[PDB]
Each structure stands twice: as C-alpha cells, then as structure tokens.
C-alpha cells in the first residue's frame, strides 16, 4: 500500500523504463502514491477541488516548452540576469535574504549569483568537465526580457485549460512562473507555500514528496521570522529524533513526474523535490496563483491550513508587538510553561 | 534584609504589640518589607507614581468607617443581599462563574450564597458557638441599598486625597468599592488585577504579600479562559515544584496592615492576603480604579505588565479564533514544540 512512486512507467516505443528505483534517495518514512490521471478524469477535477495533489498526464500545459533544452534556451532566453544558486551539498535549502538581518547567526549553505544564461551553461559545462562536485541550481522568474521565441512558446501554453482551473477554483491571479533548471541529484528540502501551484515538468524526472497541512506537528518549520520560514528544520538525510520526535510519525504522498506531467501542489501542502540521481539535468516551470479569498465567516471545525494561518499570524503579531523577533520564543514559552503544557 | 513584615508595631498607650509573628502562616519563599510612610512623604508619592506598593499610614481615607463593626453594620448597612462565600478550607480561591461552563471539570472549594447582613452575622455566630470549622468570607460591592448612616460614613471618606491621586496618576474612574469581612485565618490566594487598588484596612489585621508583575514566570496563573483566570495555580501551602519549578525563585514584598492603614496595590501586581490567625474578624474596604489609558505609541523596552497584557490578549484571541478555549493549549504547544523551546 505504501508503494511510493510505484512501478516505473514504460516509455512509448519500448524505449525501456523512464527511470529505476536506484535513482531515488532513501528516507526514513513511508509514502503512498499520488494519483496519476487524465485532465478529463472526473476524479482529477475532484482532487483539485478538494485541494489534494494529483498528477495530470495530458494537459499539454507547457507543450511548446517540451522541446526546450540548454542549447535552445541559451539561444532564445535573452540577455537578462538569472539567479543561480551554488552549494557544496545536494540540498538547496531556500532562505529569505530580507530576514537575514534578524538572524546574524544563520550561515547559508548555498549562495546566490546573478549571471547571463550563457554564463550558467558555461559554468555548468566547466563543472562536468573538470569532474568537480559543486552543484548549481538556476531559479529565475520568467520576465519581459526573454527572447521572442521563448515568448512564442509561452503563448503556446494551454491557457484555455489553466485559466478555467483558476476560474473554477476561484483562485486569485497568476503571480509568477518560476523557471527551474537543476543538476541531477539536486534537492529542494521540504517546505510549504501560501500559493496554489501547478508544477509543469519539461526535461528530466523529478521525485516529488508531499505531506498534508495536518502534518505541521511532524515537520517543525523554522520560526516565521527566521530566513528559512516555511521550510522544515528536519534534515531528511539525518533526522534528529530528539529534537523532532514527531518526524517518526510522518507519512508522505509521492510521485515521479516527467516531460508532460503537471503536478498540482495544493497551497499549504509541504513538498520535497529532488532531481533523480544520474538522471541528467532537469527543467521545470511552475505556475503560482494566489489562493481564493478567505471566507467571510469561518465554519467549524477549522481546517488544518487555517490553524497554520493562525499560528503564522500569532508569530508575526508578536514579533511586531515585542519590537524584536528574537523575543517571540521567550514570550511564547513563558505563556505555556506550567500553564498549557 | 528579607525581614518580611518587620518588627511588630507597638500600639499607642502601651497597649502591647498589635500582633506577633506566630499569627503569620509559614511559606517557602523570602520577602522584603513594603515601605510604611506618611501621605505627605515625597517618597510615598514617588512610589505610587512608579506604580510600586506603599503602605500609607495617615491618609484618613476611611476615617469614618474605623468605628464600623458587626453590630454597627448590621444596624445600618441595609436589607440588600450580600455575597457570602463558604468553604471548608482557609483558602478562598476566587473563580469566575461565567467561565465555569467552558471547564466542567472544575469543582470550586468555596460556594457563594446571598443573604441579609443579619443572616451573615447569625451564621457567623452560629459557627463560633458550636465550635464548627467551616469558614465564611463576605465580599460585597457597596451599592445604593446601604443605610443612611453608612452613606454618611461613605461621604466622610477622604475624597479630597484619593481624588487628587486619581487625577495625578491619570487613572480612569472609580469602578467600585468592595466590602470585605472575614474570619481570622481566612486567606485569599495570590492573584493580580487589571485595576489600580487602594486597600483600606478598618478592623483587624491582614498580612499582604505582593509580587511584581515580572514574577509572572514563577506564579503560573491559570489559563485566561479558566474560571480561575488571574489567580496563581501554585498551592502556597504545598508548592508542586515539579509542575511549577520557577516558584523556587519567587521573592515577595510583605506587610501587615491594621486600622487606618491604606495599602496601594499597583495594577498587575500579584497579591496574597491573609487575615492573621486568632486575630479575630477583619474588615476592609478597597477602591478599584481603572488604569490610565494605554499609550498612543509604545516605547521600548516594554514593561513587564505590558508583556502580560500581550499574553492575555493572545490567549483571548486564540480562544475566539479556534471557537473553543480548550483548543488554545494544543495550538500553543504545536506552535512551540521543536520550534521555540
């Protein structure tokens, strides 16, 4: 039952299995498979409505980008700057630079560096040749500086389908589209977002592990004011069960997406994403939409994500009232010690 | 230095000491004496301004009531109803009946009973004669149903002095005057109030032990939604150091007030009040005033009482958001476990 990503799919034309289990990293928790369905399947529509993950296999969402690759992109993406993160580890933990001032003791294991696409491809080539071990991960928002061919492809996306989704779910508006190009083995540590997300795979394969919002207690996100706000503090590769006991109770939903698949990552859902080992570079483009407007009057019982919204707000409010985020913890502890625990 | 109430004062006319140490209960913590000064003393004015306790010995605040006693009162107090609490223990822990619905597992050790003053005096006499052990504690707000003589005495209070205090401190308005008549040995467990208080002693002696607002961490008040909100959970007679470790660090300010003394109990300051053992009945009247208006913009650092105000508000807000006070604790714990502790 906890088969994880399940039996590796077979590529059309008897071209062998898309990937093999040995390309997946090993973790201490169990996982059940996310449903892989057709966009016409009533079940898929039902899952999206109930804000549950589902992998759509035939949306043609980014059909025009399926031909994208380093060469093509380096020739039509433009001369604008691209944010490229560098790290000596496979884990690319995200951090908010604007919050780094309130936590001077935080030392990022990955550094950001702006550059031209051709510079990224060059540095990428420079690594593979010398047999180096430093990893790179480009993460840039698609802006107005992209070439005409890329703009053409963008226009070719299936807006008719996604726009209807946006409408049917009452979502806000598309805030952005993140272009992700990473090296094999690259990993983005578990975290959650405050936006709805359609994750469109273009090149290579990615293993995606999601956890429902009700697993907040097992994932121990960093303090809201910390640079790693929304990210899990647990090191999936070496879980500290003394500090994070409940991580022993965590249960995820996983899947492996490839060219053409679109994974719906519901808002507030935690997700860990890794590029398959020895699977080559990977390319992805996401679609981040604002969630629907918060209800007029709340109905009880309250949903897990609503409680998460409340905790986040309490932390933010306390940080402003106390006039200093480092004082949030001492006040919270004083409130509960001997009173609520 | 931690002399507590200090050397027992000598009553004028060589009438012996007002009281002796053997009349004070024994506690596990140390205490320093509260200053006993003259209302004309600049130091007394300074203490009240800085919201620090002080015992005023010559305000003549309730001069006309100094002649009050059970007989006099039973003859001029009126036929209105008086709230009388009954308990089989010396501790009269206060509880909010309106919050008893959200905590059905709370069983009060004291019961309230309305009756006429003459009924209270009768029941009081009925106890002393039969040698019973049940204790009584009358606590009634002075209303419009009091006799003309009592009203006369009320008018004779030193309003010129207290009204100037109210004005000088910018306090709100007098909300009420509580009449307290208790039996020797009676104890009101430690708690704090959200109003400024001038505590006017009339008959008998009371030992008052106060703790600054910054001792919140050592006193473990009950949850805000619990009936005993603002009261300490620690049983002063048998401190549970496992649940309340920091009560081992508590340090109080104490004093013994008698006829004519007025104790200023600053807002937010914790106070434990006990009628001296074998000291006879005691009579007191308080003056509860609303505190000054909360500042426009807060200045940092924040005062201890302001942090207490914040914690209380967080608890209240959470109780309303979650739509159920019993859910406050689980949410608070989820917020800090593995994140702030």
């Amino acid at each position: 039952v906890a088969s994880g990503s399940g039996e590796p799919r077979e590529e059309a034309g008897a071209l062998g299995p898309a990937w093999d289990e040995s390309q997946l990293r090993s973790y201490s928790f169990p996982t059940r498979p996310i449903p892989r369905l057709s966009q016409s399947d009533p079940r898929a529509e039902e899952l999206i409505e109930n804000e549950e993950p589902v992998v759509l296999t035939d949306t043609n969402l980014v059909y025009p980008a399926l031909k994208w690759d380093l060469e093509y992109l380096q020739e039509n993406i433009g001369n604008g700057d691209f944010s490229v993160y560098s790290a000596s580890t496979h884990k690319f933990l995200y951090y908010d630079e604007k919050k780094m001032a309130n936590f001077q003791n935080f030392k990022p294991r990955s550094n950001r560096e702006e550059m031209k696409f051709h510079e990224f491809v060059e540095k990428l080539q420079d690594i593979q040749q010398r047999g180096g071990e430093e990893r790179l991960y480009l993460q840039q928002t698609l802006n107005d500086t992209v070439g005409r061919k890329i703009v053409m492809d963008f226009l070719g996306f299936n807006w008719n389908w996604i726009n209807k989704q946006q409408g049917k779910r009452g979502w806000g508006q598309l805030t952005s589209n993140l272009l992700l190009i990473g090296m094999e083995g690259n990993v983005t540590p578990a975290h959650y977002g405050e936006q709805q997300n359609f994750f469109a795979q273009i090149k290579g394969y990615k293993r995606c592990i999601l956890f429902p919002p009700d697993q907040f207690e097992c994932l121990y996100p960093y303090p809201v004011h910390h640079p790693c706000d929304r990210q899990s503090q647990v090191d999936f590769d070496n879980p500290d069960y003394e500090r994070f006991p409940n991580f022993q109770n965590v249960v995820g939903y996983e899947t492996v997406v490839g060219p053409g698949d679109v994974l719906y990552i519901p808002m507030y859902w935690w997700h860990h994403i890794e590029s398959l080992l020895n699977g080559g570079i990977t390319i992805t483009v996401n679609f981040w939409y604002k969630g629907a407007p918060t209800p007029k009057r709340i109905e009880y019982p309250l949903k897990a994500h609503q409680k998460v919204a409340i905790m986040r707000n309490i932390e933010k409010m306390l940080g402003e009232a106390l006039g200093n985020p480092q004082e949030v913890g001492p006040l919270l502890n004083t409130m509960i010690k001997g009173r609520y625990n | 230095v931690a002399s507590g109430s200090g050397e027992p004062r000598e009553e004028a006319g060589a009438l012996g000491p007002a009281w002796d140490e053997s009349q004070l209960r024994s506690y596990s913590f140390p205490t320093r004496p509260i200053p006993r000064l003259s209302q004309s003393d600049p130091r007394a004015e300074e203490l009240i301004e800085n919201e620090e306790p002080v015992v005023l010995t010559d305000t003549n605040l309730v001069y006309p009531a100094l002649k009050w006693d059970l007989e006099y009162l039973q003859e001029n107090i009126g036929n209105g109803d008086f709230s009388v609490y009954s308990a089989s223990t010396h501790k009269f822990l206060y509880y909010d009946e309106k919050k008893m619905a959200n905590f059905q597992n709370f069983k009060p050790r004291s019961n309230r009973e309305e009756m006429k003053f003459h009924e209270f005096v009768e029941k009081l006499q009925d106890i002393q004669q039969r040698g019973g052990e049940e204790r009584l504690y009358l606590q009634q707000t002075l209303n419009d149903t009091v006799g003309r003589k009592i009203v006369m005495d009320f008018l004779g209070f030193n309003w010129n002095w207290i009204n100037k205090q109210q004005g000088k401190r910018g306090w709100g308005q007098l909300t009420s005057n509580l009449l307290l008549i208790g039996m020797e040995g009676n104890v009101t467990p430690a708690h704090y109030g959200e109003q400024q208080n001038f505590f006017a002693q009339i008959k008998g002696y009371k030992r008052c032990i106060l703790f600054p607002p910054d001792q919140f961490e050592c006193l473990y008040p009950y949850p805000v939604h619990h009936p005993c909100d603002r009261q300490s959970q620690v049983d002063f007679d048998n401190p549970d150091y496992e649940r309340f470790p920091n009560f081992q660090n508590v340090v109080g300010y104490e004093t013994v007030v008698g006829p004519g003394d007025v104790l200023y109990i600053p807002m937010y300051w914790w106070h434990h009040i006990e009628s001296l053992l074998n000291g006879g009945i005691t009579i007191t009247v308080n003056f509860w005033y609303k505190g000054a208006p909360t500042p426009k913009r807060i200045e940092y650092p924040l005062k201890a009482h302001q942090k207490v105000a914040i914690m209380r508000n967080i608890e209240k807000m959470l109780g309303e958001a979650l739509g159920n006070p019993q859910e406050v604790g689980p949410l608070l714990n989820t917020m800090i476990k593995g994140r702030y502790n």
Partner: peptide
C-alpha cells in the same frame, strides 16, 4: 482576520 494569509513562496516577491 486571524485566518488571513499572505502569498509567500520559495521565490523573491
């Protein structure tokens, strides 16, 4: 409005 939320994600606003 304690259930209100923002729209932060793993990308610069």
């Amino acid at each position: 409005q304690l259930t209100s939320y923002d729209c932060e994600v793993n990308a610069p606003i």
